[PDB]
Amino acid sequence: RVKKLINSQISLLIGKGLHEFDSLRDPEVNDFRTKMRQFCEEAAAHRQQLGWVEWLQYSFPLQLEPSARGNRALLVNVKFEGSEESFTFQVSTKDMPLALMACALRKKATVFRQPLVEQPEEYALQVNGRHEYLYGNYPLCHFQYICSCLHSGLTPHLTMVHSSSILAMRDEQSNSLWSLEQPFSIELIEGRKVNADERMKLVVQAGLFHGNEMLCKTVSSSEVNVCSEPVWKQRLEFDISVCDLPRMARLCFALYAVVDCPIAWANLMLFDYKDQLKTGERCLYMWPSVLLNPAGTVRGNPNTESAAALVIYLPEVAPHPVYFPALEKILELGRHGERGRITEEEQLQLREILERELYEHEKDLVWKMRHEVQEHFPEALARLLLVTKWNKHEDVAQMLYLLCSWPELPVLSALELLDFSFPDCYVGSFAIKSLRKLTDDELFQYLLQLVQVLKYESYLDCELTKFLLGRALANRKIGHFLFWHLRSEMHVPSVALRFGLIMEAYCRGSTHHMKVLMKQGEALSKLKALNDFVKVSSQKTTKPQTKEMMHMCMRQETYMEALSHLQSPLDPSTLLEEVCVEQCTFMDSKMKPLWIMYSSEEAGSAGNVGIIFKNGDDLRQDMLTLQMIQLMDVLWKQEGLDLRMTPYGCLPTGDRTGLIEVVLHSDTIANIQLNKSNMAATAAFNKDALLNWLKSKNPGEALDRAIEEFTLSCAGYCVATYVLGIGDRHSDNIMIRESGQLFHIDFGHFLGNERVPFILTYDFVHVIQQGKTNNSEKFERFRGYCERAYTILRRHGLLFLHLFALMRAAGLPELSCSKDIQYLKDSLALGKTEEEALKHFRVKFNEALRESWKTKVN
Ligand SMILES: COc1ncc(-c2cc(-c3ncc(CN4C[C@@H](C)O[C@@H](C)C4)o3)c3cn[nH]c3c2)cc1NS(C)(=O)=O
Numbered sequence: 001r002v003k004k005l006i007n008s009q010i011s012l013l014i015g016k017g018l019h020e021f022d023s024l025r026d027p028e029v030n031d032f033r034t035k036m037r038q039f040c041e042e043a044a045a046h047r048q049q050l051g052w053v054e055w056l057q058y059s060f061p062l063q064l065e066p067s068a069r070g071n072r073a074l075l076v077n078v079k080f081e082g083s084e085e086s087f088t089f090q091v092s093t094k095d096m097p098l099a100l101m102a103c104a105l106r107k108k109a110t111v112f113r114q115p116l117v118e119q120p121e122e123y124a125l126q127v128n129g130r131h132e133y134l135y136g137n138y139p140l141c142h143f144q145y146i147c148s149c150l151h152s153g154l155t156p157h158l159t160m161v162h163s164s165s166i167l168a169m170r171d172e173q174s175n176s177l178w179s180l181e182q183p184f185s186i187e188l189i190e191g192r193k194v195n196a197d198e199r200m201k202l203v204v205q206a207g208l209f210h211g212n213e214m215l216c217k218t219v220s221s222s223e224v225n226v227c228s229e230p231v232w233k234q235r236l237e238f239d240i241s242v243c244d245l246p247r248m249a250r251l252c253f254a255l256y257a258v259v260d261c262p263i264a265w266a267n268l269m270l271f272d273y274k275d276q277l278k279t280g281e282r283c284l285y286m287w288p289s290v291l292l293n294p295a296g297t298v299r300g301n302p303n304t305e306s307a308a309a310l311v312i313y314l315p316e317v318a319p320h321p322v323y324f325p326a327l328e329k330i331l332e333l334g335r336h337g338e339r340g341r342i343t344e345e346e347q348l349q350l351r352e353i354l355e356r357e358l359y360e361h362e363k364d365l366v367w368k369m370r371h372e373v374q375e376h377f378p379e380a381l382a383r384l385l386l387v388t389k390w391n392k393h394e395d396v397a398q399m400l401y402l403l404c405s406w407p408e409l410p411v412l413s414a415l416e417l418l419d420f421s422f423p424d425c426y427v428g429s430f431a432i433k434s435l436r437k438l439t440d441d442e443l444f445q446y447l448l449q450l451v452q453v454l455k456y457e458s459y460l461d462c463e464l465t466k467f468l469l470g471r472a473l474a475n476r477k478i479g480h481f482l483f484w485h486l487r488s489e490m491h492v493p494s495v496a497l498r499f500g501l502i503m504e505a506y507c508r509g510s511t512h513h514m515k516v517l518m519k520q521g522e523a524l525s526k527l528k529a530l531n532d533f534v535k536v537s538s539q540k541t542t543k544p545q546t547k548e549m550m551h552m553c554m555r556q557e558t559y560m561e562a563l564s565h566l567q568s569p570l571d572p573s574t575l576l577e578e579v580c581v582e583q584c585t586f587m588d589s590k591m592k593p594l595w596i597m598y599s600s601e602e603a604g605s606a607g608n609v610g611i612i613f614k615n616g617d618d619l620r621q622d623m624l625t626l627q628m629i630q631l632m633d634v635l636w637k638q639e640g641l642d643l644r645m646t647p648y649g650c651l652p653t654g655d656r657t658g659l660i661e662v663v664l665h666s667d668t669i670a671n672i673q674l675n676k677s678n679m680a681a682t683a684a685f686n687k688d689a690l691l692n693w694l695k696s697k698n699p700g701e702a703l704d705r706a707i708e709e710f711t712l713s714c715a716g717y718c719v720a721t722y723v724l725g726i727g728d729r730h731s732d733n734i735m736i737r738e739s740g741q742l743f744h745i746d747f748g749h750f751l752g753n754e755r756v757p758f759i760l761t762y763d764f765v766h767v768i769q770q771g772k773t774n775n776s777e778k779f780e781r782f783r784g785y786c787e788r789a790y791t792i793l794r795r796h797g798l799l800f801l802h803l804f805a806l807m808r809a810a811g812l813p814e815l816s817c818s819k820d821i822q823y824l825k826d827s828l829a830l831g832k833t834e835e836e837a838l839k840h841f842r843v844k845f846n847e848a849l850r851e852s853w854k855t856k857v858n
Contacts, residue, residue: 006511013518014503015490015654021501028273032460032501039466040509043473044175052163053135055170056124059476060133061440063573066637068142069441074150076140078104078125080160085111088155093141097125097134104160124166128157129603132573151644152739157604173512177277177325178333178393180242180317184208186251187313188221189281191230194264194308196257202230204310205254208238208245209294210390211423215249216240218292226257242317246390247271247324248423248458250298253284253310254291262289264308269298273459275324277317284310287494295420295809297494298458327404327426333394334401340369347372354380363387374402379409382416385427400426409434411442415449415802418464420456420809432463440475445634447478448627451485452809454502455495465502473509480572482506483517484651488620491655520569523576524653526562527613530554531594534586547585550594554581563596570649570659574609575600583610591616595662610662619658621812623650625747628800629720632793636716639792643716643785644709646735646743665738668745669763670731690736690763691771697738709740711768711778715785717744718758722844723793723800723827725749725756731763751823753814758844760852773856783845790841797830 011017021029047058071094078100079086087107091100101120109116125134127145140146140156149156188204196202201223208215216239224230252267264286271277285300286308301307325333342350342365350369353362354377366373366387373384381403389395403426409417414434417427438446450468457464472479483506486499507514530553537546553559560579568574576598583597593614600607630647649661672693675683680696683689698706721729726747733746742764768782769775793800804824807815814820829837 006507006514009514009518010504010507013487013507013514013521014500015487016496016500018504021497021504024497028460029497029501031273033504035461036466036469036501036505037508040469040473040505041175043470044509044511047473048170048174050170052166052170053124055166056133056135058474059169060126060131060573061475061477062136062138063132063144064138064441065142065144065147066634067640068138069439070638071141072150074140074146074156076100076156076158078158078160079128080104080108081162081165087111091140093146093150094139096137096139098137100140100158101125101160118162122163123160124163126159126161127573127606128159129575129577129600129607130573131567131575133161134158154605157606175509175511177245177322178243180322182242182317184238184240184242184245185315186236187315188232188234188236189311189313190232191255192228192309192311193306194226194228194230194255196226196261196263198226200226200257200259200261202226202263203256203258204232205256205292206236206238207252207254207292207294208240209250209252209292210246210248211420212294213390213421215245215391223258240391242277244391244393245270246393246396246424247275248425250294250458252292252294252296253286253312254289254293255286255308255310256289256291260291262291264288265291265293265296266300266310267293267296267298269458270314271324273461277322277324278314279316280314282312282314284312286310295456297455299494299497302493302497330397331401331404334397334399337398339371342369342372351377354383370398370402374406378407379413381406381409382413382422385417385422385424390424396424400424403427403430406430408437411435411438412799412802415446415799415806418450418453419805423456423458425458429463432467435467440471440478443471444478444481445627445631446803447481448485448624449803449806451482453806454498455809455811457498460498460501469502469505469509472506476510476513477572479506479510479513480517480567480569484569484653487521488652488654488658516567519566522562523566524569524613524657526559527594527596528615528654528657530559531586531592531613531615534592534594538586538592543588550584550586551581554579554584568609568611568649568659569653570611570651570661575603575607576609576611577602577607587612593660597662608664610664612660612662613657614660615657618656619650619652619660620810621750621814622660622747623652623658624807624810624812624815625724625726625750626650628724628803631800631803632716632720632723632789635796636789636792641785641788641792642712643789644712644739644741645716645720646713646737646741648743663735663737663743666735666741666743668732669734669736672736673731673763687763687766688771690767693736694740694767698740706740707767707770707778710736710742710764711782712785713740713742714764714768715782716789717742718760719786719789719793720744722756722758723790723824725751725753725823725827727752727756729759749814751814751820753820757851758841758848760845760848762852762855765852765856786845787838787841791834791838794828794830794834794837797825797828800824800828801830 007018050058071092073090073092075088076091077086077088089103098120101123105116105118105120132145134143146156194202203223204221205218207218219236221232222234224232249270250267251270253265255264256262266284266286285304287301350365366384370384373380388399414431417431453464468482472482483503486503489495489499530550533553534546534550537549563579564577566576568576577600578598580597580599585595587593587595591614593612595610595612597610626647629645633645633647636643646663648663652658672681673689675686675689681689681693683692694706695703727749733744735743735745769778801824804821829840
């Protein structure tokens with residue numbers, strides 16, 4: 001009964017019935033399902049037996065300040081679970097949670113006149129009405145929650161949770177090739193269901209690829225007249241022996257009409273998932289184009305009824321099955337050869353290119369010196385993997401002999417190896433091996449890219465999937481975001497099977513978390529139906545009329561139940577308790593997004609949270625932009641610079657659907673600049689508006705801190721939008737917080753899409769200068785923040801480039817070519833010394849001040 005129940009709940013949550021994986025009768029899907037179910041159920045068993053602190057590390061992973069992972073006194077209100085009563089203690093920032101625990105326990109002993117059996121060690125500190133905890137040996141200032149409280153001046157509210165109450169949570173949450181010298185060849189039989197102009201002819205272009213690099217030149221078929229069912233029945237002979245074909249070789253096709261006109265493409269892996277070379281007839285269910293697409297999926301289009309179908313024939317090269325030689329035979333072949341006997345002058349020339357795109361002779365020097373590359377320049381592995389002739393088996397074996405004895409490389413170097421430019425399974429396997437040392441916070445930071453890399457994968461059962469599942473089942477937040485990255489792409493036919501299969505495997509490993517996520521999905525189901533109603537309604541009547549009707553709809557028990565008592569998909573730590581129907585509304589833009597507010601008596605002031613549900617637009621690019629700004633913030637803070645950034649949440653959840661985090665106490669620059677009457681912010685000059693509003697919100701001494709907050713966030717956003725090429729910036733997509741904090745919203749365009757200049761808006765220069773026409777003391781202190789922030793990002797120039805290259809797998813239109821990646825290389829001026837790039841930045845900063853000074857004049 002329960003086995004049947006779990007499957008039906010998995011089918012509903014993943015957004016595809018489990019029976020549909022079975023109907024494929026594909027042994028690759030069936031072997032993935034049994035192997036990963038077993039792998040996931042082991043993690044489940046390991047977890048259900050963890051210690052109580054180890055359970056806190058899984059369920060409530062520490063949220064530490066970027067400064068700690070690698071005095072000033074304060075009031076903290078502490079209480080005990082089974083009591084409404086609480087005590088406020090004066091503590092220090094330098095103090096550990098345990099000192100506060102033993103403190104909380106002394107006052108409870110005096111209040112109850114009993115010398116308490118318990119020790120501070122037995123308890124943990126929960127943030128009031130949040131799935132957040134404060135434990136480990138870290139001062140209060142090192143926790144993201146205490147640090148936050150110190151800037152908004154607020155008192156931290158904590159609850160003492162006993163070890164027995166945590167274990168209660170743990171318990172309630174239970175579950176031979178190299179002797180085939182003949183040239184490679186296929187028989188292109190015919191084409192099916194093709195749709196093209198009857199005037200033209202159909203040509204099939206096939207190509208053999210090892211990622212982006214061609215194994216041999218391309219070949220085109222004979223020009224056969226346009227008709228629905230074209231016929232060829234001709235041999236295609238490639239310029240490569242069947243002995244020379246690498247394990248990860250993909251045969252690519254491109255059907256196209258000509259008098260050029262793309263129609264469809266399709267790719268397949270020449271070797272199956274059991275290392276066996278493929279034989280027999282092959283029907284290719286084609287994907288529609290807009291010619292050769294090597295990066296595209298190697299699985300056929302699921303829509304067999306409408307899609308084009310080319311019939312090929314991989315012939316029997318031998319009378320018995322042929323497998324790719326095992327590692328033991330590979331390492332034995334590559335074990336033989338001559339080392340690099342190079343003179344001091346060529347060793348200097350080698351050091352020049354290995355520390356530096358290179359000429360043909362320069363690739364010959366890397367290859368000869370492949371042992372000195374391994375020995376003295378191991379971090380130059382990727383450059384050596386690029387010089388390898390992946391169309392020669394002896395060359396691949398010599399290379400794969402060095403890779404098996406290659407020392408582990410840093411996380412930075414491992415991320416580059418994950419690229420499609422490195423298609424070898426042993427190279428990919430080596431990348432995950434060097435990525436294991438990634439901490440949970442770093443893995444969280446790069447989890448979006450690692451999920452997109454799943455789209456480059458040639459087979460279902462892979463190291464990257466087992467790695468992502470392993471880390472996801474060891475950490476409930478990683479698991480949370482892994483699920484939503486997969487769930488949000490189920491509508492895309494090319495990944496739906498892969499992604500469907502990963503979530504099922506996850507769900508097997510966490511039955512309780514599937515139930516938690518089903519609750520998020522039920523809430524998002526209601527929000528879609530309500531948002532649709534608002535779209536239709538706003539077209540038929542006034543905003544108060546639609547708002548009231550949204551409120552009536554929300555007040556239905558079905559809605560009240562589905563929309564309340566959940567974990568936020570934006571942040572699993574945030575609990576969305578009682579839905580505040582009176583505060584819910586909708587935005588007046590094209591997609592009419594929903595503004596949903598929540599309150600929690602258990603969480604108090606911190607439990608006033610809201611989420612925005614937006615349906616109609618792809619939100620993935622916003623998310624990427626936001627994650628990139630957040631990374632900058634993390635990087636700046638690791639160098640001691642806090643630019644008071646607002647890296648608010650944005651998470652795609654489904655088809656052109658997702659969530660945006662509400663920042664309360666903020667309004668857009670435009671709304672403030674409206675300069676309305678009978679308000680505190682009303683101005684004598686419109687340039688006074690932002691400043692007047694910062695004054696109204698910040699009385700007395702407080703105003704100076706708001707001007708500083710503005711200056712810091714501004715400098716951070718001026719740099720963030722310049723490096724990322726964020727354009728279409730106006731007063732409607734620029735916001736200000738009551739604390740003085742400036743931040744940007746709605747990122748529709750990045751990376752030029754051409755050559756976006758640095759912008760200094762005189763409205764924000766007027767606040768920086770404290771309303772003074774000239775204030776060089778304050779203006780140049782802001783230029784210093786821009787510079788420092790700019791020169792810190794350049795030091796991690798290789799990281800953003802490594803991350804943005806991986807994001808090319810996402811299929812975002814503004815991230816589709818090397819022109820987009822080049823944009824970042826120019827914005828960070830990576831091909832320059834720190835001096836040159838700085839002088840250049842100043843040229844562009846002064847170019848922006850001259851442009852700002854246009855308004856200043858009037
Ligand atoms: C990807 O697109 C977006 N990305 C972000 C936001 C957005 C937009 C806002 C926002 N825009 C205006 C206001 C302030 N208003 C909100 C209104 C409900 O109540 C007023 C008191 C102040 O807040 C916001 C506030 N916190 N978080 C926010 C996020 C909106 C959108 N979509 S859009 C431009 O609304 O179509």
